[PDB]
Each structure stands twice: as structure tokens, then as C-alpha cells.
């Protein structure tokens, strides 16, 4: 039985348990700022940032055919200067060991319009309506494609704290993602089945990707805390 877990309620500059990509930085105030931002807080267009947990996670085993169960939770906020013109969004994802940034903007740094490059499984918090999207901002479960296999409505709130919980149950293959704004007492939830064996390598890294809009600022994305725990039985 392999397990790993970690948690923290601040990030900390230059922390070596964190791999940053693109525009990502950790502020003095302890936020994982995923996007480039001007002096007063305003996001720049075509920003993209990612951040991975250092440690690769053993997600399934070929020998035994067993699959990991896991849980991830985090608080995130966004700042949109113009609340009626929004910037693609943010996602939690699993990807290969060596994952690098993919197409930005509406592909969220995670997928591409072509066939693919990586094998990615993700839960998206999507602010802008692309051609493959349903109307209005939403949560989505994405399996090797930016076209979510299922979505649900996401009750955005500018600046407010979103508490996310994401779980995967290997016994049912059910991925479940919930979002809560405690200040608003609003909740959203989503669930679908995902076969990890056919959508991810045995070992992956997990992390966050957030993209701002192509021609427009849209919104910045800050992750404030993070927990994860995973269990791979025989």
C-alpha cells in the first residue's frame, strides 16, 4: 500500500517542493499567483502559469492493475477588473512526470486543438465560452480533451474565496468535484466516471494551470492553500 499526503495553508517563496512554469510566482503574502499582473493587481492578456507538486504520484500499477484513490482540496480566488469580460479560467490536473505547458487561453495550458501532446485529466473552472463550451461559467471534468465529458454551472464570485474538494474513488472510478463559497453559502458539484489506466501514465504529477484571455485581461487566478492525499493499494 503506497500513500502520500501533504498540506499547507500558505505558499512560501522559492519553496523547493513546488515546480513553477510560465508566469507562476509565489508572492510574499503567501499566494500562488498563477498569472502575470501589473503593479496594482490587473492581469495581463495571454498570461499562463502552472505549478506542480514536486513529488510524482503513483496513480496506477501495470503489474497488479490496481488504481489509486485520492483527494485534493484548495482555496482559490480571482480578480476580474471587468466582470462582464472573463479570461478562460483555472484547473487542477494530473499529467505526466515531465509535463510542460500546452496551448494557453481557452485550452488553459492543459490541452491542444490537435489530437494531443500530453495525457491529461483535469477539473476546470472555466470563465469564458469557447465553441466547445456550454453557456456560462462552469465546472468541468476534462479527460484528454478541453471538451469536458460533463459540466455544471459555476456560481462565480469576483475576489471571494472558493473552497474546492476533488475526490477520486477507484472502486467506482468516480471523480467528484465540489466548489463552495462560504461567504455566499453557495455550492456546486459535478461527478463522472474516468478510467485512469487509459487516460494517464502510471506515475503523474498533479498541479494547477490558469490562463488569462488572449486579447483581453479577463481575470487573474490565485491559489491560497493546498491539500492532497493518495493511496495505491495492491
Amino acid at each position: 500500500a503506497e500513500t502520500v499526503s501533504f498540506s499547507w495553508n500558505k505558499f512560501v517563496p522559492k519553496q523547493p517542493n513546488m515546480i513553477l512554469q510560465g508566469d507562476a510566482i509565489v508572492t510574499s503574502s503567501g499566494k500562488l499567483q498563477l498569472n502575470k499582473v501589473d503593479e496594482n493587481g490587473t492581469p495581463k492578456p495571454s498570461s499562463l502559469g502552472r505549478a506542480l507538486y514536486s513529488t510524482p504520484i503513483h496513480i496506477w500499477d501495470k503489474e497488479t492493475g490496481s488504481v489509486a484513490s485520492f483527494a485534493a482540496s484548495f482555496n482559490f480566488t480571482f480578480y476580474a477588473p471587468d466582470t462582464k469580460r472573463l479570461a478562460d479560467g483555472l484547473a487542477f490536473f494530473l499529467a505526466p512526470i515531465d509535463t510542460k505547458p500546452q496551448t494557453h487561453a481557452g485550452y488553459l495550458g492543459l490541452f491542444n486543438e490537435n489530437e494531443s501532446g500530453d495525457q491529461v485529466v483535469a477539473v476546470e473552472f472555466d470563465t469564458f465560452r469557447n465553441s466547445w463550451d456550454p453557456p456560462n461559467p462552469h465546472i468541468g471534468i476534462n479527460v484528454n480533451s478541453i471538451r469536458s465529458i460533463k459540466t455544471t454551472s459555476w456560481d462565480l464570485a469576483n475576489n471571494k474565496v472558493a473552497k474546492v474538494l476533488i475526490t477520486y474513488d477507484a472502486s467506482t472510478s468516480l471523480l467528484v468535484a465540489s466548489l463552495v463559497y462560504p461567504s455566499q453559502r453557495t455550492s456546486n458539484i459535478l461527478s463522472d466516471v474516468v478510467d485512469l489506466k487509459t487516460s494517464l501514465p502510471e506515475w503523474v504529477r498533479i498541479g494547477f494551470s490558469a490562463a488569462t484571455g488572449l486579447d483581453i485581461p479577463g481575470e487573474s487566478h490565485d491559489v491560497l492553500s493546498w491539500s492532497f492525499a493518495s493511496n495505491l493499494p495492491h
Binding site: 487561453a105 481557452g106 465560452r129 469557447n130 465553441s131 488572449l214 486579447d215
Partner: peptide, 4 residues
Amino acid sequence: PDTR
């Protein structure tokens, strides 16, 4: 209407 999607961008590009």
C-alpha cells in the same frame, strides 16, 4: 462566437 469563439475567438482567435
